[PDB]
Structure 1
């Protein structure tokens, strides 16, 4: 019937790609801080992630919810200075 010796290197390939994907997802979640990745990022979404990084204070996507923003928040606004492009 079915030979285990033929399917054993396929068992290895299946296990290596499976353990690779599982370990990668755990590293992505540990990078975000317990939540999932953002798999497609708009210009609007990129500006919004920068705004959130300005809102919460330091941390990546802490995702605070407050009525009224703090006082360093009005002053920590950044402009981006781009070089000459010669």
Structure 2
């Protein structure tokens, strides 16, 4: 027959992988503002996310207004560090 008590630990192992998958996807989704996350982000994507924030306030915020709001021309972030150049 089929020894199913032998299979129960495999079901536990598979289900733990399911919890990590579901949990990671959920917490990232909430972190990005009820939005799917970004992955494999290069320097171009990183810069585009900073530009989105200086338009909306959120690194994931979107807007399609063809005109920038006032003060956008002053809020471009120049990053400051002490040591490692």
Does the pair score TM above 0.5? yes
- Give 5+ residue unaligned stretches, structure 1: none
Alignment-derived partner of residue 76 in structure 2:
77
- Give 5+ residue unaligned stretches, structure 2: none
Runs of 4+ in 1 over 3 A off after TM superposition: none
Instruction: Give the drift of 1:66.
Output: 0.6
Instruction: Give the drift of 1:20.
Output: 2.1
Q: What is the Cα-based RMSD across aligned positions, in Å?
A: 1.7
Go from structure 1 to structure 2 and tell me whether the alpha carbon gap of 1:81 and 1:7 turns closer, same or farther (over 3 Å shift).
same
Go from structure 1 to structure 2 and tell me whether the alpha carbon gap of 1:3 and 1:28 turns closer, same or farther (over 3 Å shift).
same
Alignment-derived partner of residue 17 in structure 2:
17
Instruction: Give the drift of 1:16.
Output: 1.4
The SS at the match of 2:79 is strand
